[PDB]
Design a protein around this nucleic acid. Structure first.
Ligand SMILES: Nc1ccn([C@H]2C[C@H](O)[C@@H](COP(=O)(O)OP(=O)(O)OP(=O)(O)O)O2)c(=O)n1
Ligand SMILES: [Ca+2]
Ligand SMILES: [Ca+2]
Lengths: 52, 115, 308, 357, 49
DNA sequence: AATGGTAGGGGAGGG
DNA sequence: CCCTCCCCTAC
């Protein structure tokens, strides 16, 4: 289910019966890389804080 | 500083006998003009533009909307070239629609407000 | 109200009155049109005749061989103050100080023939005894192009650039003298100064026109970028050549200098930055001027063109 | 003021037949009239607020090419060469675009002196001035001359990437959204237009004064049969190139024909108005005054770089090459021959071909 | 802004007068206004049902 | 139909 | 585990 395959618009998402945001994809691939860069310049990995 | 009230509304109504007065009362501020069809409304719009003679014609996304919508209606339905009438002279721009308004009226400028 | 809050109409009218183009050509045309509108007037004032190369001539010119300087930043978390220097109007001030223009180019210092020369998109022929006559009044660029000095001919690009930059620095000096006035005036003055900065930058970019150009010159822009890189490197050396200022430059993007002062009580970092700016400015031609303009007490340099 | 002021809100050009307000002849081929001349339409607004349409006549586009003869002509061979190149250009253009009468593409060819801008030239150079009729095909014509299709040899084109409207605005010191100071006009079919009713609601006392000052109704209004109105607005005028008085305020300098600088800052005139507006809007804020102190700078002995020694050696080698035994001087370098007095300068050449009074 | 009007699925009229002012009203309430048009599209009020 | 350049990084999909 | 294609930000 490639990212292009789901790609719901706000109109389709707010009217869909059973549609929930991809919390795993959102969290990981939109929050973990930039925080990893910013905090590996310091010496701490942010990915370990989310698994707990 | 002429008498045009700087605002106006044009509404189509084939004329029942209650809609014009109701609209005028609910507005109470802007003088509303009612016409029998949209061709008369476009002719009145042409006369209005020729009266004030504005140097800039603008709008929000005028390609698929107000100015472009009126132009396409006049070109497809009524076969009436309104772009030659709105110009200040009686007698296919790909770069236009890309970074500006593709509508080119002689004498007047066109501003795509969203761009 | 959307066009009145941004003052779009009045700003475009002012920009058309400054350049000299129609109101529609301000947002519908490109950037070369404004530079052309300036140049046609400035050159017709002095009886110049401009060249108009074709599309086949611009493509067959020499490619750009001079690149700017982007230092690799030391990616870390900086706790101590990090002074951020910056040249104001780098390339325009360079064209003004070193007298770079089309009217002063003599030719590349190497392979100077007497009948067949090459400068960008044109060919020409030097006189018999012009080099033995001008050996004193020349300024060879780092690229290798010989330019006539100001004592024999003042360039035309310099005039437009000085006028535009004077107006810009006046706008900036007026903008930096108001604290109580809200963004109602500061935002408009910032927009005006940014428009003038863009005008100067596209006046530079009008040269060598790598694609879709109308009067390019690869050698001119190459010399401009090369002498800019050389000025930046000389500034780096001057800053790192002082023992009292035990500073080290950690980043810089073709004009900037991020000097790091470990544990330096930022109150005095302003004085150190002002002294560094004055010292680097007093070693350059007149229109060149280094500015301090801020300091980063905490900072993170992620990579090139990425920091906070 | 004492001038008729028109602002530049929008401009456009069109083609029309040569009337008595348009040039119909030339100097190279005077016996061949024109078939169509360009006319510029300037949609502007009077200082009172009334829109006005202006038909600017006599403005013809042009472009320069390198002169082929020598500077030792006797002013009679010049006209022969101009007629020959005019005939060649006209024939070749008519053959390309599919007794050589009624010129349709080329108007006239003259001989002007000039100084090239792409490079360091310190001497007068002779050029042609190919005044064209239809500017839309101008570039196309260049694409022929630069390709060697007209003549046998390829010719570089000078001042052709500048459009027609930009040339017109630069030649007459005109700026966008600025006033056109003109002292004489020519009015057309009824001055107050009666499209629907605007001849009564828009007129006021100021417009009436402007009309009474510049409109005489006896020898100033053009006939309705020869010059009908083509404008859906208020008063319509026609001006000649002689009438535009925004020019003659330009400072023409010739400091590039000799080593004159070897023996003033406001060059851009449109920046002084912005500076004045800035001083006004900063004095309204109780700011004292503007000033800038100069910093005493001490550059390097020669601002040398990495390859400065190699550059100096190469310059010495080139000076040894480009030299033939003598010594050059700044006064005797450029030869004091070919006086170039009869040859017209670009700003002294455009006043030519203007039709008449 | 400051006016009481009467809507009956065919438009509205201004309820001018004095009997209409000395009575509290809430929008949506229906009444049986009996008045008289005087000089414009403004209805006077004499009695209320 | 008209256009100013260079440099840099990050994410997605197919390999 | 490298390539192109796309986004868009900074000089
Ligand atoms: N759109 C741009 C932005 C910048 N530059 C080049 C020309 C500048 O000389 C140089 C410096 O970029 P800046 O953004 O710092 O602009 P300036 O240094 O010229 O002015 P200022 O320092 O006042 O912002 O980059 C360019 O060619 N085109
Ligand atoms: Ca800078
Ligand atoms: Ca910078």
């Amino acid at each position: 289910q490639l990212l292009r395959e789901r790609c719901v618009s706000p109109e389709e998402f707010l009217e869909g019966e059973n549609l929930e945001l991809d919390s795993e994809y959102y969290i990981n691939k939109i929050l973990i890389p930039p925080l990893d860069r910013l905090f590996n310049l310091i010496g701490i990995n942010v990915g370990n804080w989310a698994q707990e | 500083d002429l008498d045009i009230a700087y605002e106006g509304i044009m509404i189509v109504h084939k004329a029942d006998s209650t809609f014009p007065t109701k609209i005028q009362h609910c507005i109470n501020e802007i003088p509303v003009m009612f016409y029998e069809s949209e061709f008369e409304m476009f002719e009145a719009l042409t006369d209005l533009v020729l009266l004030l003679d504005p140097d800039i014609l603008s709008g929000f996304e005028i390609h698929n909307f107000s100015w472009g919508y009126i132009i396409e209606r006049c070109q497809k339905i009524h076969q009436f070239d309104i772009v030659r009438e709105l110009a200040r002279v009686k007698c296919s721009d790909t770069w236009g629609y890309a970074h500006s308004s593709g509508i080119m009226i002689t004498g007047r400028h066109m501003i795509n407000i969203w761009r | 109200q959307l066009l009145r809050k941004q003052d779009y109409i009045a700003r475009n009218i002012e920009q058309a009155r400054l350049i000299g183009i129609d109101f529609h050509s301000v947002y519908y045309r490109g950037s070369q049109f404004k530079v052309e509108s300036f140049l046609i007037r400035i050159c017709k004032s002095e009886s110049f005749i401009l060249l108009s190369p074709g599309k086949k001539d611009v493509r067959k010119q020499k490619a750009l061989e001079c690149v700017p300087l982007v230092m690799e930043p030391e990616s870390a978390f900086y706790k101590s103050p990090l002074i951020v220097l910056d040249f104001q109007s780098l390339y325009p001030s360079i064209m003004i100080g070193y007298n770079y223009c089309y009217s002063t180019m003599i030719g590349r210092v190497r392979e100077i023939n007497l009948t067949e020369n090459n400068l960008g998109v044109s060919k020409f022929s030097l006189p018999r005894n012009i080099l033995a006559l001008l050996k004193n009044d020349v300024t060879i660029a780092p690229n290798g192009v010989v330019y006539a000095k100001t004592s024999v001919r003042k360039s035309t690009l310099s005039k437009m650039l000085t006028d535009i930059l004077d107006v810009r620095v006046m706008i900036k000096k007026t903008m930096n003298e108001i604290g109580d006035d809200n963004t109602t005036l500061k935002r408009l003055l910032n927009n005006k100064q940014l428009a003038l900065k863009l005008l100067a930058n596209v006046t530079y970019g009008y040269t060598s026109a790598s694609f879709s150009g109308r009067m390019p010159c690869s050698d001119l822009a190459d010399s401009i970028v090369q002498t800019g890189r050389e000025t930046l490197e000389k500034a780096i050396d001057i800053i790192e050549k002082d023992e009292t200022w035990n500073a080290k430059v950690v980043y810089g993007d073709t004009d900037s200098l991020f000097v790091y002062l470990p544990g330096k009580t930022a109150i005095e970092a302003f004085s150190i930055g002002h002294a560094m700016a004055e010292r680097v400015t007093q070693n350059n031609p007149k229109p060149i001027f280094l500015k301090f303009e801020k300091v980063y007490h905490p900072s993170i340099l992620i990579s090139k063109k990425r920091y906070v | 003021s004492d001038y008729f002021r028109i602002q530049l809100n929008n401009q456009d050009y069109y083609m029309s037949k040569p009337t008595f307000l348009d040039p119909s002849h030339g100097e190279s081929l005077p016996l061949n009239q024109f078939s169509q001349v360009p006319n510029i339409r300037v949609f502007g607004a009077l200082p009172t607020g009334h829109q006005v349409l202006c038909h600017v006549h006599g403005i013809l586009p042009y472009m320069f090419i390198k002169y082929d003869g020598q500077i030792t002509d006797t002013s009679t061979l010049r006209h022969q060469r101009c007629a020959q190149v005019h005939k060649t250009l006209e024939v070749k253009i008519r053959a390309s675009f599919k007794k050589l009468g009624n010129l349709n593409f080329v108007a006239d060819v003259s001989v002007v002196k000039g100084i090239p801008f792409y490079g360091y030239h310190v001497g007068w150079n002779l050029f042609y001035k190919i005044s064209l009729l239809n500017p839309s095909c101008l570039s196309r014509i260049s694409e022929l001359i630069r390709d060697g299709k007209i003549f046998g040899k390829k010719f570089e084109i000078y001042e052709s990437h500048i459009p027609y409207l930009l040339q017109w605005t630069a030649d007459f010191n005109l700026f966008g959204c600025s006033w056109i100071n003109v002292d004489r006009c020519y009015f057309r079919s009824p001055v107050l237009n009666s499209i629907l009713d605007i001849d009564k609601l828009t007129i006021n006392d100021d417009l009436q004064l402007l009309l009474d000052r510049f409109c005489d109704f006896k020898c100033n209004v053009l006939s309705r049969r020869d010059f009908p109105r083509v404008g859906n607005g208020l008063i319509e005028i026609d001006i000649l190139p002689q009438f535009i008085k925004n020019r003659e305020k330009l400072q023409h300098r010739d400091i590039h024909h000799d080593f004159l600088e070897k023996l003033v800052k406001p060059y851009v005139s449109s920046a002084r108005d912005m500076i004045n507006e800035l001083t006004m809007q900063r004095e309204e804020l109780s700011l004292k005054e503007y000033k800038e102190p100069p910093e005493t700078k001490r550059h390097v002995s020669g601002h040398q770089w990495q390859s400065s020694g190699e550059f100096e050696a190469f310059y010495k080698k080139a000076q040894h090459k480009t030299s033939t035994g003598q010594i050059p001087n700044f006064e005797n370098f450029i030869d004091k021959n070919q006086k170039f007095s009869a040859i017209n300068t670009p700003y002294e050449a455009l006043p030519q071909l203007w039709p008449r009074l | 802004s400051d006016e009481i009007m009467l809507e009956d699925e065919s438009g509205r009229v201004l309820l001018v007068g004095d009997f209409i002012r000395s009575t509290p009203f809430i929008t949506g309430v229906v009444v049986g206004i009996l008045g008289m048009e005087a000089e414009a599209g403004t209805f006077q009020v004499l009695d209320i049902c």
